[PDB]
Every structure is written in C-alpha cells, then in structure tokens.
Amino acid sequence: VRYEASLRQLEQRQLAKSVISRVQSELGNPKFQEKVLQQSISEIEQLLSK
Amino acid sequence: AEYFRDEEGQDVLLFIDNIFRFTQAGSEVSALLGRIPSAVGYQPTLATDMGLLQERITTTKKGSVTSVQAVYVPADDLTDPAPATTFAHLDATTVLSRGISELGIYPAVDPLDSKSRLLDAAVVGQEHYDVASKVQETLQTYKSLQDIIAILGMDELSEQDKLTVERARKIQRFLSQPFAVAEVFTGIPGKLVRLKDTVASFKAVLEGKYDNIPEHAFYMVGGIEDVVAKAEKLAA
Amino acid sequence: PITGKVTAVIGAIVDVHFEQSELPAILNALEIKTPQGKLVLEVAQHLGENTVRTIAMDGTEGLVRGEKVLDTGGPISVPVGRETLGRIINVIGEPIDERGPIKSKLRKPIHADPPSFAEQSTSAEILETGIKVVDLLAPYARGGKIGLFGGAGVGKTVFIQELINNIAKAHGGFSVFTGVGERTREGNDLYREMKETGVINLEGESKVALVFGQMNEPPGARARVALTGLTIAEYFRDEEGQDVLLFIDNIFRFTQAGSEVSALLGRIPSAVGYQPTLATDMGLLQERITTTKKGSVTSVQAVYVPADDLTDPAPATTFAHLDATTVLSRGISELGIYPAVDPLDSKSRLLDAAVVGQEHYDVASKVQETLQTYKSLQDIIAILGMDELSEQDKLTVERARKIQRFLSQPFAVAEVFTGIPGKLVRLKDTVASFKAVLEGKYDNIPEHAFYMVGGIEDVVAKAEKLAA
Amino acid sequence: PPPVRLFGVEGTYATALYQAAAKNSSIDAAFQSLQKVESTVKKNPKLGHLLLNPALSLKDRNSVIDAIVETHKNLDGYVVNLLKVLSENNRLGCFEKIASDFGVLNDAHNGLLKGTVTSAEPLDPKSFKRIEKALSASKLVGQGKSLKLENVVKPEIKGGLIVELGDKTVDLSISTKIQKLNKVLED
Amino acid sequence: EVSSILEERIKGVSDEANLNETGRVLAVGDGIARVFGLNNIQAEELVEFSSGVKGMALNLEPGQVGIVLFGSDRLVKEGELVKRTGNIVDVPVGPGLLGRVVDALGNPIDGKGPIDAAGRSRAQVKAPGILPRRSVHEPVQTGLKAVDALVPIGRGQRELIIGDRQTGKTAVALDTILNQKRWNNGSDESKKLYCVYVAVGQKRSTVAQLVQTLEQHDAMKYSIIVAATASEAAPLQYLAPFTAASIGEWFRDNGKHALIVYDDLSKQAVAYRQLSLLLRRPPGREAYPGDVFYLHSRLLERAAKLSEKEGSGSLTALPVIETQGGDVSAYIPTNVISITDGQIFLEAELFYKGIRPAINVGLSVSRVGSAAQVKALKQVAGSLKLFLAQYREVAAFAQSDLDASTKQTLVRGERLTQLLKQNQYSPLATEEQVPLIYAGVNGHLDGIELSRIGEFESSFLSYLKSNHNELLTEIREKGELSKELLASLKSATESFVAT
Amino acid sequence: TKAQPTEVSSILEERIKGVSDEANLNETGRVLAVGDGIARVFGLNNIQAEELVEFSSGVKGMALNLEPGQVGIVLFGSDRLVK
Amino acid sequence: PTNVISITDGQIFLEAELFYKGIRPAINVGLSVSRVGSAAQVKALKQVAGSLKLFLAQYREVAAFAQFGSDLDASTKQTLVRGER
C-alpha cells in the first residue's frame, strides 16, 4: 500500500515533466503565434463586451 | 532530515544544538534588516521563525523525526521571552538545573520541572503513573519541608515526615545514573537501565523495601542491583 | 459647503484633504456620511497643504479613500435639556436607549475652557449626604471631586444609586452617570437598576441622565465621553442654575484611552506609557468641575488603580485633582455595615475645624480617635482577652462597638436591597447624634440596638423596641 | 486643483509648476520647452547624464542653469523659474521626473489617456486598430480624454497580451495561466 | 487516474475579465507589499495578487496602500499586478462547521470538503449593545465540581482562564467540551451549546491530537475547530478570534447557545505585535501594540446573552491567557483581567501537589458566579465556600501541636481538597455532583480516610445508582432540593458511609 | 527623495511665481502646518531668537527653532485659535 | 555578558562581597564552571582534589543553613568546620 501511494506521487512527478514538455511545445510551435492571434480576438470580444 | 524522513522513508532522530543561537542570530539580522526590535531585542518574526522550524519537524505518514534541541536559557531565566517562546513550541521539555549538577547528581535535571507530551497515566502504565505520582509527591514534600528544616530544624518534623525525608534523599540519589560520557569526567563507566526495570525498582524504594539501604549506596550508582551491590561494598 | 476627500486611512487616523481656504480649525468636528449613519472624525492637526489630520471616534473599516467629508465647524454640539435626563446617549449624542429621537432645544459644544478665576468661588462650600458616615468623616463639597475606591462587588452601584436618591431629596438636583469602559453586562444591570430605583422612570422623569461608553467603543470615543458629559452637567449648572453630581467610571480607562490617542498621533509616550498630555487633559477636565457663582458641579469619579500602584503617575495625577477619597471596603460590608465605607481610610480635605465647624471637627476627631484606638485596642484585646480591658478601656470598646453599629444606614435605595426601610439623616442631626454618643448617653442601650439603625431620633425608637 | 495625484512627492514640483503656469495658461508651451531642453540634455552626456547624477554645488548648479538657457532661448519662463528653484533646491536629478509628471498633468489638462498592450511580440496594426476601436467603443474612453495605445514588446510577458490603461486591465498572458496550471498539477 | 481528475479540475478554469483595478507593488519586504494604484479599495479588503496571495489593506496611505500579505513571499515578486478581490473580510457561517476543522479562510484542513454555509458574514463587526441583553441565569456546568460550585458562570458571559503555561491549559478547557456532550445529546437547543475551540498558533500535530481526542469522545458533531496553526501566518492569527466570533453569531442569532474558547490570546497578541511593528506603528506597553487593548475589548464584548425581545440566544466565551511564568501583572493580562467577568487561576504548587485540576480557587473569581448555577447545587455549596475558606487560612497552621478547632478544620478541609481532584478528561454529571458535595456538607466524609476518599467516591456513586437512583432522577429533574429530598439523601449517605 | 520644508507646495508655488518676499517674509510670516502646540511659520526672516510673536488669532508664542526657511514658534495658548 | 558566556568554555566569576570577606583574589565558584572537565589538569592534582569539590559544595549548603543558626547536628558541623578551614 505504501509503494502504491508513492506511485501516485511518482505519477504526479512523471506528469510534472509532462507539463514542462507541453510548455516547451506551446512555446516552440507557431501555435505560439497562432493562438496569440486567437487570444487577441478573444480579448477584442471581451473588451468589446465592456 | 526531510530527505531522510520523506525520500528515504527512514525514521531518524534529529539533534540540533543550540536553538538559542538560532534565535540570537535571527534577532541580529532583523535589526540589520531594519525591523523594529521586539521584547528583549528579539526579532518580531521570532515566533514564525521558530514555528517554521518546528512545523517542518513532524511525524508524518512518511516518517518520524525525533528532534532533540539544545536551548541555552540565559541566566537560567525561562521568563526570558526567547526561552519561553521555545517552551511552548516544543513537545518534550527538560530543565537542567545548575543546582542539581552542583549536588553532584548527573542527571542535572529538575525532576518536578520535567514534562513531556507523553507523561500520561494509562499511556505510561497505571503502575508507572502511580509510582511517578508517589515520587513527585515525595520530592515535592521534601522541597516544602526544606524551609521547615531551615529555620525550625530537622528535629521538629514528624515520624511520617522523617520516613518521607529519608526516602526522598534515597530517591534523590537513586535518580543518579552514571553515564558513559562521564568516563571523561569521573571515569566511572555509565549505567543505563531499561524502562521496565526502572519502574519496578522505583516502586520498591517507595514502598521502603530499600530503606534498609544507605543513602550513599544510591549515590552515583545505577540500577537496583548496583544500589544493593554498593550497599554491600560500603558494608564491607 | 465645506467638503474634502479622504486622503489616508492609516488606522483610525484619517487624513482628509479639503478644498482650499475651506480648511478646518483644530478641534473642528467632521462628519462623513456612511451606511453607518455618520462617522465623526475630530480634527486634531492640520498636516497643511490643504490636508489635515483628524482622529476617528468610530471604526474606519471598509472605507474607500476619497470619501466626501462635511465639516460641522467645531466641537460636536450635543443635545441638552431636562429632556436628555433619563436618556442613554452614545458619544455622538444620539439615543442608544432608543426611546425615540432625543428631543432637545439647544445643543452645545463638547469642549469648553474652564471658568475664569473670577467666576470660580473664593470660599468653601459643603455638599450634604444623607449617609451619616459620609457627612462625618469625609464631608462632601458642592464643586468637589470625590474619588470612589472599592469594587462593584461591594455594591459600588448601590452606593452610586444611593447618592442619586440623596441628591433628589437634598437639593432636587440632577446627575449624569458617565460610564467609561463599561462592560455591556454592567451597563444592562445599571439600566435595569436605574429603572427599578426610579432614578429613571421610563414614563415620567428621571433624575440621572445616562451616557454609556462601552469598552468595545473605540479609544477615541472613550477619550471624548467625559468632556461631552461635562457639557451636559454644565448645561444643568450654568444654564439651569442647579447643583449636579456627575459620576465618571474608571479614570484608568480614561487615561488608557488618552494614552492610545497619543500613540496613534505618534507622540512620544511619556513615562509608564501614559500620554505626555496626561496632566493637562485632567487639568482641563477637572477645572470644568467647579463651583461657579450660579451652580456647582460635584463629580464622583472611580479610580481603578493599576495593580494598586498609587506610585504610578496616572493615579497620582488623579489624586491631585481629587479633593476627597471615599474608600469603600468589603471588610466593612462583611461587618454588615452598609455603607461599606472604611472609616479609617476615608478622608476629605474639607474636614477641618474651620471648614465644617469646630464642633463638627471635634465630634469627628473624637469619633475618629475612638475608632482608631478601638481598632488598635482590639488587636491585642481580642487575643489577650476582653477582661484585659480596663473600665475606661471597655467604656471605649463599648462606645466604639455601639458607634460601629450606629454607622450603618439602612438607606432608601437599598430599602429593597437590604430589605430594611431607608434612613436619610440631615447634617445637623448627624452632628447631634455623635455628640450624644460621645457623652455616652446611649451607653445603656446595647450595641445591637443600633445595628442598621439611623440617627439619634431613630435609636430612641430602637431602644424602646430593644426593651420591648 | 491639479488633475490627479502624482502618487505623492516629486509631483509637488509638478503640481506647483502646473498651477503656477496654469494661471498663465501656458502649459503646452512649457511642455514644449521642457521637451526641447530634455532632448538636448539627453543628447548631452557629460553633465547631461552626469548632471542627472548629483555631486554639483550651488554655484556649479547655477552655472549649469546658465548653460541651460543657451539650450533654449526663452520659451515659458515659469519652467525657467522652476530651473532656478531646482538649482536652489540643489537637486536636478529628478528633473526628467518632474518633466514626465508635468507631462501627465499637461496631457490630463488636454484630456488624454495613455494605454499599452504589452506583449512579447510587436502586434499587427490591424490588431492595434481593432483594440483602439474597442476601447473607444467601451465607455472607458469617455471621449474628451483621448486614447493613446502603445503596443510594447516585453519578452518577460512571454505570450498572450495585457491591455492596461486607467486602472483597468485585461491580462491574458500565457505566463500567468501556466503558473496556475502547473502549480495545481503539482498537487 | 488521479492525473486525469486533477487535469479536469484545472481544465475547468478558464477566462478572466475580473481584473480591473490593478496595483503594482513598489517594494515587497516583510510581507508588507506597498502598492501605488488600487485607488478605490475598501479597508481590510481582500486583494488577490498575480502570485495569488491574499491580503488585507491596513494602511491606506495617500500614495501607497500597504497590503499585508497573508502568505509567503516566496512566490510574491515586485511590480506585481494586484487584482482587487473587492470584499472586506467575510467568512462562511452556517451549521456545516459543526464537525469541521477549518483554516481561517474556512478551507478545511481536515479536508472535509464543502462547508454548509448559510451566510458569508463580515469578520469584524460591532458587538451586541445594552438593549441586546436578558438577565443571565442559565447554568454553565463544565463537569468540574470546583468550577461548577466555587466559580460558575452563565451563558453569554466572559470568564478568563488565565494560568500556567501548557499545564494542560488546553486540558482544563477540554474538560468543559466533554461535559457539553451530555447536554448536547438532549434535544433542547438551550442544552445544545455548539462549541468552538479556537486554536491560535498551535502545532498541527498538537491540534491533531486534540482532534483525535475529540473524535474519541465523539464531541465532533457540535465541535468546530477554528485553526490558525503555528505555521499559519500572523494575519490569519490576528483575525482568528474575530473570524471565529462571526461563526458564533450565526448560532446565537438563531437563538441557540454556544461556547467559544479563545486559546490563547497570548499568541494572538504576538501576531498583532508582528503586524504592528512591521507596519511600523509605534508599539505599546511591554512591546505589545498600543491598540491591542482595543482589539481585545472588541472581541471580548461580543460574548453576550441576548434580550428575550431580540430572541434569547447566547455566545458564552472563555478566553485563555497563558501566564508567562505566572505573571498576571503583564500588560496583556492586566487589560484582559479588567474586561473579563471572572478568572480561573491555575497554580503550579497545586499541580505539583497532584491536585489536578490545579485551579487555585482563591485566585479564581466569578463576577457572574451564583447567578447561574443549579439551585440545588447552590443550596449544598454555600457551606463549601465557607469551609474551604477556613481550610485555606488554617492551611498554614498545618506544619505540630495544634489546636483541636484548627485540627477539626484540617480534617474537613483536607478531605475536601482531595475531593475536588478529578481525573482530567473525565467530567461528572451534576445529578451526582450534588450528592458528593452533600456528603461533605453533612461531614460524613470526615469519617472517611484520605486514600479511601477516591474509592469511596465511585462506590458512593454506584451505591446511589443502585439504591437511590430515584434520588438521582429526582435531583436531576427537580433541579432543586426539598427538605424531604435532602432528608432522604442524607439517609442514603449515612447508609453508604456505614458501609 | 527627501522632503524639505521649502519644498512644500505652497512655498514652491510662490517661488515659481517669482519673488513675493521682503518684509512679508522678512518680518512677518504666514503660518504653515500647525498642530502639536508648535507651528511652523514661513518668513519672519528677521525675528529675535525667543522673540514674542503675535499671530493673527490673538495668540502669541515664543520662537524656539530658527531653521533655514522656517521658524518653529511655540504657542503660548490654545490651538483652537490657530489655523 | 550573555553573548560571551555562550562563546566561552568556562566562566570564572569573582564575587566582590567575597573580596571583602577576605578572599583576595576573590572567587565565586558557584558561578564558575568549566564543562570541559578535568581535561588539562595535572594528574596528581586531579587525584587529590577529587572530593574537594564535594566538600566545598556541601560547605556551601551547610554554611547557608548555619547562618539560620538552627540546632546543628555534628555531621553538619563537621562539614562546617572542614569547609571553613
């Protein structure tokens, strides 16, 4: 049971490096560019709703 | 220690020395940091600094850590805020009194002032509790009567009191237990007596089963076997 | 049309920036409209640059910096009238008894500098008290400040009730009970008592007017309650020409409140913490308590000594202002003697052969000497035996124990409370009573036939009942 | 009263200057002279940047003022009285600070709002216009107080964008979202 | 997977539009970020940082608003955008906090999830006035005989628990909570005191032991543990009693009764000291803030027995002050001593002399006293006060050739001293408290040996339980003792004493 | 940076406005920020040390601190008079 | 003094009253400790002075009692006499 609990923590740390990888993927891809354009239009809609 | 407790999983026994130095150090850089000095110049962040240190040290479902933290009590005043704050923050206090050291007893502990989280009744065992209640009362009485002895004189006490005084002096010197680290002091090899054995032996003393044993045959000797042996030694 | 926007709210110290040339004067009162009604800030500085520094008397929580402020233009003007008698009024001058809006004709500023040297009376004046003990060993004065000592457990409150009753018969005067640092429990009890003892009659008039300042009420309002109260008293004295009696509760908490306001103002706390303006604040307050040519305000104040350190500056400063001290003790109450006055610890500076008369003084001195000798005599007389008393000595012991019992007034407020009909004994008859006891004319009437018995006339009856 | 606080001090100069020159109404002129002397001060390095570093005397400061009025022959003598004041107050270090603050007061008097669209990227002009349009559409640009909106490149705000103006913000940066996202997946 | 569930929860948070009033930290030191911005901000408003830390805004200065960060500065950095949460402090209040160990915000540190909260009410609010008062008379029985007879108090009232450092200060308190179980079990909600223990600056382990003990005595089902642990920072600690009080208002407002034990205001003071000194405010006497008195007075006057008119409710309180080596002259004690309606003063000698409770009843006082307490218990304990009074005076005469009168006193008095010992964490039922004291009153315990007092006691109780359980039920239900009931009771005592 | 008493905005506003001194400030003053029973006055550049000054409010005070740009009078009297 | 006490390995308190009492140089050995034991003490002197400490410690207790001047037992007066010498 102890090693099982340890494995749950280990899964989170496995997933921790997965967050790092996914951050690098977003910042690597021109999804970095294309989703910034998406954010721009989303902010336009948000700010227009003000 | 956290790495041991957590990552290696192993329980440990932490030892830190001296935590007044931890306080003193923090007080000093608080001043340098420009914080308005609190009482007796102590850092305003004293509580939280002590608190962080203590809170970090704990028994978790990953391990157990047993800190023994030395504390230097300036001029033996526990009314000093830095010792007093630490006094709250710890769970198993011990007071080491100069007077008791001077009596030549090593332990130098003040027995009435020792307190611990575990120092219960049933949890320490009903017998243990009762024995300890009797010890505490005997010593507390002995201390109370010390004033009476001081002015009025020893001779104005009752028979019951005299038996209590005789037991108390014997108990006082039966609390003395040689230490290995007083092979650099006395040279006398240490003695360490297992818990069950101590409970039994103290019960006997209180009952007066060893009131037929001289006071000095308890002095600076260990367990009951030793006390009896030193009684024989003094006898011949 | 004075308006300004709040430019700081560091604690309860609110700095307000006011439109140019419309700036307050120091001691003005500002009102900030709030859903809490108003918050009253009192200007205690000008920080200049069209900004001021004020203190608050109410809490400042949830404030948004920039709130509009309106300036009343001076120290708050609190409603006054006989209308305000029997109305519990909070510091700002609004009903907390909530028996409708406080009806008032005139309102008057809470600050007001002491009367002129000329205006103040040049000769002594004595205030009567139905209590024989008070009138003998520490006679009151109409302008006087008489500082009560001894707990509320002894029945401080009953003593206070007693005085109000006596005043009503004596003069038909007024009173204002100002309570500083008053526990909500104590306030309830007092209100309930005051209704009961008819010093407040909800329907019909009320002798006592109440100003209650609870402990919870902020330190600033704690400081200002007294001065407001004094104005009310002064409306009675000055503008109704009638003698008044103004109670104050703990003056320690008056000091504590003042000390805090100093610290809030950032001013260097003078020795033992107390405000550097400690002396002056008492000086202004207790010179607005005086005998004017038109009235006299008597004030009974309560001195909560800080761990019985009379040595501490705050009590000392108070005792300087105080003229007499009445020192109630629980030992006395335990001897069943109501009043609870400890006769060898009550002293007034108006006790003199000149001030209260040679006869009064001599009678008092003999009685004092009797008591003084009696107590000291009882120390070894009790231990050694009562037979060790000489005929002369036991004449004194007998007289003393007869006097001791004779002291207890079964007084009117506590007619219910002890259960025994009240005794209000006039000053002339008090002197007369003790003269006769000094001549030992009632040294044939045993000591317990004076227990809970009023004056000389009264113990004629009791003497008859004792026999019968 | 002056338009808006200067979040305190250094603006006490700006306020004084503002109101003093306000009654002469020459605020634009003042601003222009301050700009002109500021530009040539910036384009002067020894004691045009090391004059921004205090170490100068009263007398040496006065002689710097004399050099300064060579830098602009006339143009608002209230800021020339301000120069005297600053030399007399023996600090000219926070000089551009006062200039900037006076600029804020000036363009507040004009009624101008300043904004920024910080990104780590230099956004499209189409984007600039759409946001400018949006801001004008919103009640936030009240009209009377104009809109200046500057996209700036700040790599620190990596990805997304944050619009800022008049204590009104919208922050859809990636960094903040990443921070929250990461942290909760360490639970 | 746990990974998927966590992802789902986080994934379900998107879209911002709330931020408006920004602030920017100028400098962050000491947990005191100083912002130029946030022009319109309420005082003690909740503010949410970029980091996410929450604060209150104690200093509103003309050019900077000095936020006090509730959390660590580890993730806080300078220049940070400070979104304006826009709410002055409010905490969930409701019935759900019964059986909940919560942190100050209300986030369960026992992780018992969502809280049944019927309001969010502000934490700093003004106290019940003169008009919100009804006469105090409702017994508060802690199941400790000395407390119940010698120093009892009514509901809605203050009474200090000022005593020696960790001499089971918490233990003395805990005994009361256990006795509240008996009344709690009963349906009547005047008999349901919904207890709150307010653990200020206390180790999570220590409180875990407390929690575990409470669970063992099943007291969790009316207990609320407001927790500001040692680790929990000084802002939380500052607001910890105030926040707790607000919870109490909900029960009280419902007309119910409850008991809040503030433990210990000594650590609250230090936290305020930390705040004030860090806010550079001048510190008061004994280096404890000048307006610490103002804090305490506000807090301690909120305990009130409300008017019948405004509904009879109450909020009994029992503040705990830790005496720094038995010092009662200290600034924080002196202030508190004045406010409180009673004190209980624990004494070290007594503790050593094995008198547990170690309460020194001479230095314990009640200013509510006999106004509340069972009439029955009042009848049979007037004598007790007087007897004990003599025993105290004649205590010093205990150390030779002693007068018979003194010696008689010593016999009665010593037996009483043993009798008021009670094994801590065991409270007693009042219907059996009245018998034990009655025996002492009838002096039949004079004939019982000191060691045998203890055995006698339990035996006497069992004897009453079998033989005279009619009497026990009568004492309980009548709540008063008729001469005939005292007669029968005396007979029972005599009979038991004979055996 | 630092806040000097001459860097007060009312002082500054006069200074930017040129000179306005001379007797107005050489032998009369105009009061600045006031409270704490001491007042800080602008001008009075001629003023004997410990002179008695009479304020326009009736009250008179004794000059204590002669400082470069300000004089700190000590008010012999009530502050309600002063503004 | 507090700072130094921690740093050092011993304290050698001299008492002024004891200076006057006639120990010149004075001492005050109740407030003098060296917790580094009998290290760096000559072996001969270690043997001889072994109970010197006990005698003096007993003397300290006994002398206090003697000042109260209660009826002293011979055992205390052996100590008292020994201690004085």
DSSP result, E137-177: --EE--S-HHHHHHS-EETT----EEEETTSSHHHHHHHHH
Residue D88 with chain F: CB contacts under 8 Å: 15
Q: Is residue E5 part of a domain?
A: no
Spatial separation of the C-alpha atoms in residues G15 and B119, rounded to whole Å: 41
> Does C186 lie in the same domain as C290?
yes
Residue contact A15–E3, C-beta within 8 A: yes
Is E164 marked as a binding-site residue?
A: yes
Spatial separation of the C-alpha atoms in residues C267 and E63, rounded to whole Å: 23
Residue contact D184–E21, C-beta within 8 A: no
Q: Which residues of E are catalytic?
A: 367
Q: Quick check: D74 and D99 in contact, CB under 8 A?
A: no
> Does C299 lie in the same domain as C211?
yes
Residue contact A39–D172, C-beta within 8 A: yes
Block residue for tokens 């996410």: E52
Residue list for the binding site of C for ATP: 150-157
* SS3 of residue F33 by DSSP: strand
The shortest C-alpha distance from A50 to chain E (Å) reads 9
The shortest C-alpha distance from B44 to chain G (Å) reads 20
Residue contact F16–D9, C-beta within 8 A: no
Would an 8 Å CB–CB cutoff place G71 in contact with chain B? Answer: yes
Q: Which of D8, D167, D185 is nearest residue E37 as measured by Cβ atoms?
A: D167
- Chain G CA closest to residue B150: G65
* Residue to test with chain E: of D157, D167, D168, D180, most E Cβ within 10 A: D167
Residue F12 with chain D: CB contacts under 8 Å: 12-13, 16-17, 85
Residue contact E131–C98, C-beta within 8 A: yes
Q: Which of A40, A46, A48 is nearest residue D123 as measured by Cβ atoms?
A: A40
Give the CA dihedral E116, E122, E123, E126, nearest 10 degrees. Answer: -130
Q: Which of C27, C44, C49 is nearest residue F10 as measured by Cβ atoms?
A: C49
Is E168 marked as a binding-site residue?
A: yes
Strands D112-119, D146-153: pairing is: parallel
* Length of chain A counted residue by residue: 50
C397-421: string of b/e by CB count within 10 Å (b at 16+)? bbbbbbbbbbbbbbbbbbeebbebe
Residue E133 with chain C: CB contacts under 8 Å: 184-185, 188
Residue D71 sits in a domain of what CATH number?
A: 1.10.520.20
Q: Quick check: C245 and C128 in contact, CB under 8 A?
A: no
Give the pair of three-digit tokens for residue F81: 């008079």
Residue contact C48–F33, C-beta within 8 A: yes
Q: Quick check: E230 and B55 in contact, CB under 8 A?
A: yes
- Chain E CA closest to residue A5: E2
> Does E270 lie in the same domain as E128?
yes
Residue C317 sits in a domain of what CATH number?
A: 3.40.50.300
Residue contact B88–E287, C-beta within 8 A: no
Q: How big is the C-E interface in CB pairs under 8 Å?
A: 118
Q: Would residue C336 be called left, alpha or beta, if left means φ above 0 and alpha means ψ between -120 and 50 degrees?
A: left
Query: Solved by what technique?
Result: cryo-EM
Residue contact D164–E22, C-beta within 8 A: yes
Residue A47 with chain D: CB contacts under 8 Å: 131, 134-135, 138, 163, 170
- Chain B CA closest to residue E353: B137
The DSSP code for C95 is B
Strands E224-229, E316-317: pairing is: unpaired
Residue contact D159–A27, C-beta within 8 A: yes
> Does C169 lie in the same domain as C312?
yes
Those residues with Cβ within 8 angstroms of residue D59's Cβ, 6 or more apart along the chain or in another chain:
none
The shortest C-alpha distance from D25 to chain F (Å) reads 13
> Does E77 lie in the same domain as E101?
no
Residue C113 with chain F: CB contacts under 8 Å: 78
Q: Quick check: C140 and C107 in contact, CB under 8 A?
A: no
Spatial separation of the C-alpha atoms in residues D172 and D176, rounded to whole Å: 8
The DSSP code for E457 is H
Residue contact F1–D9, C-beta within 8 A: yes
Q: Please name which of E131, E82, E138, E183 lies closest in space to residue E427, comparing C-alpha atoms.
A: E183
Tally Cβ neighbours within 10 Å of residue A12.
16
The shortest C-alpha distance from A13 to chain D (Å) reads 7
> Does C225 lie in the same domain as C104?
yes
Q: Quick check: C56 and C43 in contact, CB under 8 A?
A: no
Is E165 marked as a binding-site residue?
A: yes
Number of independent structural domains in chain C? 3
Residue E294 with chain C: CB contacts under 8 Å: 218-219, 260
Those residues with Cβ within 8 angstroms of residue E450's Cβ, 6 or more apart along the chain or in another chain:
E414, E415, E418
Q: Is residue E434 part of a domain?
A: yes
Which class for B110: exposed (0-12), middle (13-18), buried (19 or more C-beta within 10 A)?
Answer: middle
* SS3 of residue C212 by DSSP: strand
> Does E458 lie in the same domain as E398?
yes
Q: Is residue E174 part of a domain?
A: yes
* SS3 of residue E341 by DSSP: coil
Query: What's the fold here for domain F21-83?
Result: Elongation Factor Tu (Ef-tu); domain 3 (2.40.30)
Residue contact D176–E50, C-beta within 8 A: yes
Q: Which residues of C are catalytic?
A: 156, 182-183
Residue D119 with chain A: CB contacts under 8 Å: 36
* Residue to test with chain A: of D170, D180, D184, most A Cβ within 10 A: D170
Residue D8 with chain E: CB contacts under 8 Å: 62-64
Full residue range of the structural domain in which residue B194 is found: 119-236
Would an 8 Å CB–CB cutoff place F7 in contact with chain C? Answer: no
Full residue range of the structural domain in which residue E466 is found: 374-499
Residue B228 sits in a domain of what CATH number?
A: 1.10.1140.10
The DSSP code for B112 is G
Residue E412 sits in a domain of what CATH number?
A: 1.20.150.20
Q: Quick check: E368 and E159 in contact, CB under 8 A?
A: yes
Spatial separation of the C-alpha atoms in residues E146 and E137, rounded to whole Å: 18
Spatial separation of the C-alpha atoms in residues C227 and C111, rounded to whole Å: 6
Residue A8: enclosing H or E segment and its boundaries? helix A2-28
Residue A11: enclosing H or E segment and its boundaries? helix A2-28
Q: Please name which of C260, C266, C254, C267 lies closest in space to residue C317, comparing C-alpha atoms.
A: C254
**Partners of C450 in beta bridges:** none
> Does E442 lie in the same domain as E422?
yes
- Chain E CA closest to residue D173: E16
Residue E199 sits in a domain of what CATH number?
A: 3.40.50.300
Residue contact C49–F34, C-beta within 8 A: no
Spatial separation of the C-alpha atoms in residues E458 and E477, rounded to whole Å: 22
Q: Please name which of E391, E400, E401, E379 lies closest in space to residue E355, comparing C-alpha atoms.
A: E391
Q: What is the resolution of this structure in A?
A: 6.0
Residue contact D9–E39, C-beta within 8 A: no
> Does E385 lie in the same domain as E311?
no
* SS3 of residue C69 by DSSP: strand
> Does E197 lie in the same domain as E62?
no
Give the pair of three-digit tokens for residue B96: 């080491």
CA distances from C157 to D58, E277, E431 (A): 72, 41, 36
Is E340 marked as a binding-site residue?
A: no
- ∠ Cα C370 C375 C377 (to 5°): 90
Give the pair of three-digit tokens for residue E149: 């007879």
Q: How big is the D-E interface in CB pairs under 8 Å?
A: 42
The shortest C-alpha distance from D119 to chain F (Å) reads 32
Angle at which helices E265-278 and B46-56 cross, to 10°: 120
Residue D170 with chain A: CB contacts under 8 Å: 43, 46-47
Q: Which residues of G are catalytic?
A: 35
Spatial separation of the C-alpha atoms in residues G85 and G81, rounded to whole Å: 6
SS (H, E, C) chain D: CCCCCCCCCCCHHHHHHHHHHHCCCCCHHHHHHHHHHHHHHHCCCCCCCCCCCCCCCHHHHHHHHHHHHHHCCCCCCHHHHHHHHHHHCCCCCCCHHHHHHHHHHHHHHHCEEEEEEEECCCCCHHHHHHHHHHHHHCCCCCCCCEEEEEEEECCCCCCCEEEEECCEEEEECCHHHHHHHHHHCCC
* Residue to test with chain F: of C26, C51, C227, C281, most F Cβ within 10 A: C26
Interface partners of chain E (CB pairs < 8 Å, 3 or more) are: A, B, C, D
Give the CA dihedral C371, C377, C379, C385, nearest 10 degrees. Answer: -130
Phi, psi of C303 (to 5 degrees): -115, 110
* Long-range pairs for D8-12: beta carbons < 8 A, 24 or more residues apart: D8/E62, D8/E63, D8/E64, D9/E63, D9/F1, D9/F3, D10/D94, D10/D97, D10/D98, D10/D101, D10/F1, D11/D98, D11/D101, D12/F7, D12/F8, D12/F9, D12/F12
Instruction: Show which of E71, E87, E103 is a domain's final residue.
Output: E87
Full residue range of the structural domain in which residue D106 is found: 11-110
Amino acid at B87: F
* SS3 of residue G47 by DSSP: helix
- ∠ Cα E455 E457 E461 (to 5°): 120
Radius of gyration of chain F (CA): 13
